[PDB]
Amino acid sequence: RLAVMVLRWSDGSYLEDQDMWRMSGIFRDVSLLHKPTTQISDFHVATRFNDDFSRAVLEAEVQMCGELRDYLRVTVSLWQGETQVASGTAPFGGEIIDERGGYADRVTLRLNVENPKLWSAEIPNLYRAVVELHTADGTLIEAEACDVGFREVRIENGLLLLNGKPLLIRGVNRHEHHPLHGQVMDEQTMVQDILLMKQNNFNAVRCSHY
């Protein structure tokens, strides 16, 4: 038995003065997650490009918790559909960062990707990155994963650029609102919103304000 005492007002409310209905409760999903003792505790995916975007490096920083061991390995593989595009495997132990050494509980993988299909609102090209925590001879501990979009966002010469091209934001602010369920969001409503926005030539959304 779980018991949850939810308070309507808190010191937190001073930072939650958005122009919206003031409601309360357990209004998003509750879940139970099982992880092994030795586990992926964090991972960051970055994508860097050459000048013409004909080459990319996918860089993946992975962190573990649990007992450090020489036999531990991380494999990051990148998939385009059912096709494996790139893969890297390394033991734990980051580069030296200061006078006391590096992160023994971290590893950075670097995958080369030739002519990556680029992500934009116009063509949302996605790859699948799988992060496998495993033993040297390939016994899996656990896998995490995310969708990867190869795109570069930068400000140069006073212009916001996506993949080297100046954006024109056709944006709208969107609160999480349903007239019957209040501030509880469901997939069907989210999808309905996305289709309508795209059907009406929007390419961008601001998470107003959370």
The distance of closest approach from Cβ of residue 119 to another protein in the complex, given in angstroms and rounded to an integer, is: 24
The distance of closest approach from Cβ of residue 166 to another protein in the complex, given in angstroms and rounded to an integer, is: 8
Judged by CB, which is closer to another protein: 81, or 158?
A: 158
The distance of closest approach from Cβ of residue 158 to another protein in the complex, given in angstroms and rounded to an integer, is: 5
Binding site for another protein (CB under 8 A): 157-159
Residue 79 CA to residue 58 CA, distance in Å, equals 12
* Residue-wise DSSP of the chain: -------S--GGGGG---SS----S--S--------SSEEEEEEEEEEE-TTSSEEEEEEEEEEES---TTEEEEEEEEETTEEEEEEEEES-PPEEETTEE-TTEEEEEEEEESPPBB-SSSB--EEEEEEEEETT--EEEEEEEEE-B--EEEETTEEEETTEE----EEE----BTTTBT---HHHHHHHHHHHHHTT--EEE-TT-
Look at residues 139, 143, 147, 107 and name the one whose alpha carbon lies nearest to residue 35: 143
The distance of closest approach from Cβ of residue 193 to Mg ion in the complex, given in angstroms and rounded to an integer, is: 22
Judged by CB, which is closer to Mg ion: 134, or 174?
A: 174
37 binds, among another protein, Mg ion, none (CB under 5 to 8 A by kind): none
| The only residue of 1, 2, 19, 179 in contact with Mg ion, by rule CB under 5 A | 19
Judged by CB, which is closer to another protein: 166, or 171?
A: 166
173-192 residues in contact with Mg ion (CB under 5 A) are: none
The distance of closest approach from Cβ of residue 156 to another protein in the complex, given in angstroms and rounded to an integer, is: 8
19 binds, among another protein, Mg ion, none (CB under 5 to 8 A by kind): Mg ion
Contacting range for Mg ion; rule: CB under 5 A; set: 15-23, 90-98, 127-135, 163-171:
15-23
Contacting range for Mg ion; rule: CB under 5 A; set: 1-9, 17-25, 167-175, 187-195:
17-25
User: How many residues bind to Mg ion according to rule CB under 5 A?
Assistant: 1
Any bridge partners for residue 134, and if so which?
73, 140
Give me Rg for the CA atoms of the chain.
Answer: 21
**19 annotated ligand binder:** yes
Binding-site members for Na(+) are 19
Binding-site members for substrate are 19
